[PDB]
A paper describes a structure:
Microtubule associated protein 2 (MAP2) interacts with the regulatory protein 14‐3‐3ζ in a cAMP‐dependent protein kinase (PKA) phosphorylation dependent manner. Using selective phosphorylation, calorimetry, nuclear magnetic resonance, chemical crosslinking, and X‐ray crystallography, we characterized interactions of 14‐3‐3ζ with various binding regions of MAP2c.
Although PKA phosphorylation increases the affinity of MAP2c for 14‐3‐3ζ in the proline rich region and C‐terminal domain, unphosphorylated MAP2c also binds the dimeric 14‐3‐3ζ via its microtubule binding domain and variable central domain.
Residue numbers in the entry:
A (entry chain F): 2 to 6
B (entry chain E): 2 to 7
C (entry chain A): 4 to 233
D (entry chain B): 4 to 207, 217 to 233
The structure:
Amino acid sequence: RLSNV
Amino acid sequence: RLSNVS
Amino acid sequence: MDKNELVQKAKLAEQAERYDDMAACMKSVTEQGAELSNEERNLLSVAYKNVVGARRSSWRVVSSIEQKTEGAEKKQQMAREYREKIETELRDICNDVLSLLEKFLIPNASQAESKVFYLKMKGDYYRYLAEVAAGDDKKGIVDQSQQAYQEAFEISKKEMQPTHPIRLGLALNFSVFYYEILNSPEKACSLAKTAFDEAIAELDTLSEESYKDSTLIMQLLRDNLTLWTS
Amino acid sequence: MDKNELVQKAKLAEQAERYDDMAACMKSVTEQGAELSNEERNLLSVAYKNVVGARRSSWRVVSSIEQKTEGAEKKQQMAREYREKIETELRDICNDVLSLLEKFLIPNASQAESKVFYLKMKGDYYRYLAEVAAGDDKKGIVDQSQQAYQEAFEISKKEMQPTHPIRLGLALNFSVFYYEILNSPEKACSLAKTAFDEAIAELDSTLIMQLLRDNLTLWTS
């Protein structure tokens, strides 16, 4: 997982 | 400046 | 106490890396009843990304120590209690944002773009709640996340180019939810792939305004598409 | 409630990067009135380092903005009040520490090592308070900083090895106080050179010695 930052 | 740790 | 002053503080606070303050400012702006501008909207969402992000990361660490002290039962009890404290913070914060969404931000959204943005935010803070939810309460919260994600997805499909960074970020976060919350790696990966492929195929539409952010998100998409089907 | 319980909280908090929590735990351990272990004392000092360091950093930022908006008067006023907010927290935190030092840490210090460490802390947090003090209040507070540093300096000359990191640490800050607060680059340099001079003898620590050198190049260049 890698979600918006 | 520059004092001790972190 | 007037709107422009709040927005000024919030940026000051953003400069000072003091996000509780940035949050509180944008909260008050929101509570004044009028639809946020694009700047205000982005300040608010940046403010709470950081406020919420700190706790979720603190939870990751303390949770991880809880797992790793099985057999050291007093140590573990200690970590469990501290995790509970963090979880209480997570809850006030989520319930603040979800309450702003329900009372002001979603009712006041007149353009489709801002409805998607806010419906996706809701999916997010519902996602965060669900990560620290117990039992039957959890099941309910998970549906709530899915519903707000899904509704955002349908408006984005209708009203926004595939290269729009709000639409792309929605796709990322939805695919993440499918994977991390509903344990569907297939559903997660297909949604990720479609989002990314459709952005590529309509690269013509990527504006210079949107370029930096869309690309960042597309990276995150393809990165996640890798380590899901490794 | 319990001391072992609070020490573990503090470590957990540190792992979590939640230093308000870390500090409060170690506050409660101090307020139990017994002399802190070395472990506990480093917990305390790390905790408030971070708590205080975040405001010093924020203050710097908003203060830069207050300056750079001269002419834009309403904007400057906004920055100025916000700086004032930060200064209130900075004062709460300094008074907290200084109070723990008056009531608990300095009275209970049974060894030279720790009395010096804590008198330096006092120098430090008086320095911090001073940096956001007004008028005559500033002057008296700068003095209290001088005194705590001096006393620690005198005890360290007499009771500690010149290579000891608490003793070199004292010399760094004390010399930095001479530069930054009292504008004495001659007193700053002398002090820092003398500590480096006396440590180098009994090497037969490096980081602090390096830091002394670093600061020395800045002041004269």
